[PDB]
Curated annotation (Swiss-Prot):
Gene: shc
Pfam families linked: SQHop_cyclase_C, SQHop_cyclase_N
CDD domains: SQCY_1
Bilayer disposition of the protein: Peripheral membrane protein
Protein family: Belongs to the terpene cyclase/mutase family.
Activity relative to temperature: Optimum temperature is 60 degrees Celsius.
Full protein name: Squalene--hopene cyclase
Organism: Alicyclobacillus acidocaldarius subsp. acidocaldarius (strain ATCC 27009 / DSM 446 / BCRC 14685 / JCM 5260 / KCTC 1825 / NBRC 15652 / NCIMB 11725 / NRRL B-14509 / 104-IA)
Length: 623
């Protein structure tokens, strides 16, 4: 048996050993230290500071700090000002003196970059909440935003789902401009002393007279003593949040809206209300005790995604469709299907619910990637209740079809969330504020649809293929919206095109395959650093990683190049780097939350992607 077959066997065993008893897989989702620095400030604001938890956060913050005293958005990344400021503030709050060495190094970096005035809106706002920055200088999000109807400019349904609940809860918070002063010893006036002139970070899409004027007017309005209908607007914001709280207590299964909603409830004197109580208590599910004694808070949690990918990888590796561990995973997945309408129903009010979310319980926010991967995984299994499996797949498939956007692609949560307005408000200087269709999500949908044998005679698929063709870059690659980066998008897109019957001998696909081969590293693997999002010199370039090597391999295998020196060397790379336990290490992030601003380490990718790629490789070589 060739070396790759034994490597595969060991990967399969390792992946099965990671499965939880209930049937799902779930790895920690890594990001950056602003999650934990903001949890420290949240504890301060809510007056619920647990000393033992603070010690573990201190230990984690220091462990994440690099030797030059800075923190980054991803492992090996450039020093990040916003992140370093928040870690410094949380450390001083926990108890480190500004005279300790780690604090001095951090401060030197912070002051070298223009301090607190050069930091993003959310960092200044967290400081305003604790009395360290003026609320008058934070861009206003007025509660009267709730009066804008669904076809009005800047209404909440023009924002992407992850920004929408944030806008609603912050409209309550900014309405009151609450201040929860820090103890004297934790104050940070030193963050205003700068080496260089501070420079305000602006809106990602660029501001403009009308937007600066509106922001100025909203601050002037804020100063008035009477605000007609403001209370009514606040009640709409509160009701909107109360109706949509997720079953785990979060808002949308993600850190920002959750923390801001809890502050909004605190400010409204609702700490004895079940939404606040359950919202507070649910936080522990997202915390992770680390092996070196630290504690972290997950930006989000990925069990459905981890599970659907693991099933696909194990099926590709050779486990039968009725393997008992996969049957258990399949039955667990069937119970996660959502049968109620979510915010997506604003654009699709007659579309029958059938999606899946990322987290365990988040019914109002199913997403296209999880639905595609779960429907596809279910299609590879044989379960005891076949009629239930078929009905689930039909409902999920139909829900994906109904969520297709007008340009032929799919966004993650909504249809046609393409408004250009949210990009120009002062508030939006960080991350993405809208959810337009992207290449990788579209490609995953096509892989799912392709698994049922459909092709571009079906206009849904044809429109999607034309969208991918228009988005292909000049060098032949495809961008990675949610995975790192041109390797991820290129790998997803070529697999998708192959899966729906496109002839991979066409020149545009051959060009993408050559792009993949030209980026292979000397060690035989492929890698792509997160610097790729802001620097063209890093396109398809970085230290090799198991997951990015797997993506490149999948592009080559889908393109008919399994029997090529490039694929042989990639397989050998995976063989040679596999750990004794059958898994792989991956100290670099290969996930993307927001291009340029927020990166993710999906800890299962290093095991599930190599298993998947090696299984596809084996099948291509055997056939
Ligand atoms: C009976 C109450 C009034 C309901 C009438 C609806 C009137 C429509 O709009 C007027 C108020 O809305 C203005 C919104 O504030 C600006 C939005 O967001 C600011 C930038 O983030
Ligand atoms: C603003 C910093 C806090 C970051 C939270 C932003 C949350 C944005 O979503 C990113 C993580 O959640 C993944 C959701 O979408 C689908 C999951 O499948 C993944 C790739 O297609």
């Amino acid at each position: 048996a060739p070396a790759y077959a034994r490597t595969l066997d060991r990967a399969v065993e390792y992946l099965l050993s990671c499965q939880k008893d209930e049937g799902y897989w779930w790895g920690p989702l890594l990001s950056n230290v602003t999650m934990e620095a903001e949890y420290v400030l949240l504890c301060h604001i809510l007056d619920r500071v647990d000393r033992d938890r603070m010690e573990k956060i201190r230990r984690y913050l220091l462990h994440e700090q690099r030797e030059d005293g800075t923190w980054a958005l991803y492992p090996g990344g450039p020093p990040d000002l916003d992140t370093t400021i928040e870690a410094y503030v949380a450390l001083k709050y926990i108890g480190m003196s500004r005279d300790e060495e780690p604090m001095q190094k951090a401060l030197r970096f912070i002051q070298s970059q223009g301090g607190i005035e050069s930091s993003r809106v959310f960092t200044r706002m967290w400081l305003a909440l604790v009395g360290e920055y003026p609320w008058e200088k934070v861009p206003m999000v007025p509660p009267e935003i709730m009066f804008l109807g669904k076809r009005m400019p800047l209404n909440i349904y023009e924002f992407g789902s992850w920004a929408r609940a944030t806008v609603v809860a912050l409209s309550i918070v900014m309405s009151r401009q609450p201040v929860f002063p820090l103890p004297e010893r934790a104050r940070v006036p030193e963050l205003y002393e700068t080496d260089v002139p501070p420079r305000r970070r602006g809106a990602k899409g660029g501001g403009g007279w009308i937007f600066d004027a509106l922001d100025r007017a909203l601050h002037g309005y804020q100063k008035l003593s009477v605000h007609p209908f403001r209370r009514a607007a606040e009640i709409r914001a509160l009701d909107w949040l109360l109706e949509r709280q997720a079953g785990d207590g979060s808002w949308g299964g993600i850190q920002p809206p959750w923390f801001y909603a809890l502050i909004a409830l605190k400010i409204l004197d609702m700490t004895q209300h079940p939404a606040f109580i359950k919202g507070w208590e649910g936080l522990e599910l997202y915390g992770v005790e680390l092996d070196y004694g630290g504690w972290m808070f997950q930006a989000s949690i990925s069990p459905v995604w981890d599970t659907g990918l693991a099933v696909l990888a194990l099926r590709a590796a050779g486990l039968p469709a009725d393997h008992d561990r996969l049957v258990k995973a399949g039955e667990w997945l069937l119970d996660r299907q959502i049968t109620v309408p979510g915010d997506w129903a604003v654009k699709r009010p007659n579309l029958k619910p059938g999606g899946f979310a990322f987290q365990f319980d988040n019914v109002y926010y199913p997403d296209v990637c999880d639905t595609a991967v779960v429907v596809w995984a279910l299609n590879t299994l044989r379960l005891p209740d076949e009629r239930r499996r078929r009905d689930a797949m039909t409902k999920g498939f139909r829900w994906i079809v109904g969520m297709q956007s007008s340009n032929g692609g799919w966004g993650a949560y909504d249809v046609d969330n393409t408004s250009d307005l949210p990009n120009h408000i002062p508030f939006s200087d960080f991350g993405e504020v809208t959810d337009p269709p992207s290449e990788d999500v579209t490609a995953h949908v096509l892989e799912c649809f392709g698994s049922f044998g459909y092709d571009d005679a079906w206009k849904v698929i044809r429109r999607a293929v034309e969208y991918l063709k228009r988005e292909q870059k000049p060098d032949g690659s495809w961008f990675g919206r949610w995975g790192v980066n041109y390797l991820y998008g290129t790998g997803a897109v070529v697999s998708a095109l192959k899966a729906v019957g496109i002839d991979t001998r066409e020149p545009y696909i051959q060009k993408a395959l050559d792009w993949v081969e030209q980026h292979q590293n000397p060690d035989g693997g492929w890698g792509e650093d997160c610097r790729s999002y802001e620097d063209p010199a890093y396109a398809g370039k970085g230290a090799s990683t198991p997951s990015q090597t797997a993506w490149a391999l999948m592009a080559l295998i889908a393109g008919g190049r399994a029997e090529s020196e490039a694929a042989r060397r990639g397989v050998q790379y995976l063989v040679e780097t596999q750990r004794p336990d059958g898994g792989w290490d991956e100290p670099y992030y290969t996930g993307t939350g927001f291009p340029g601003d927020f990166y993710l380490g999906y800890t299962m990718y290093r095991h599930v992607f190599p298993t998947l790629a090696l299984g596809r490789y084996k099948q291509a070589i055997e056939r």
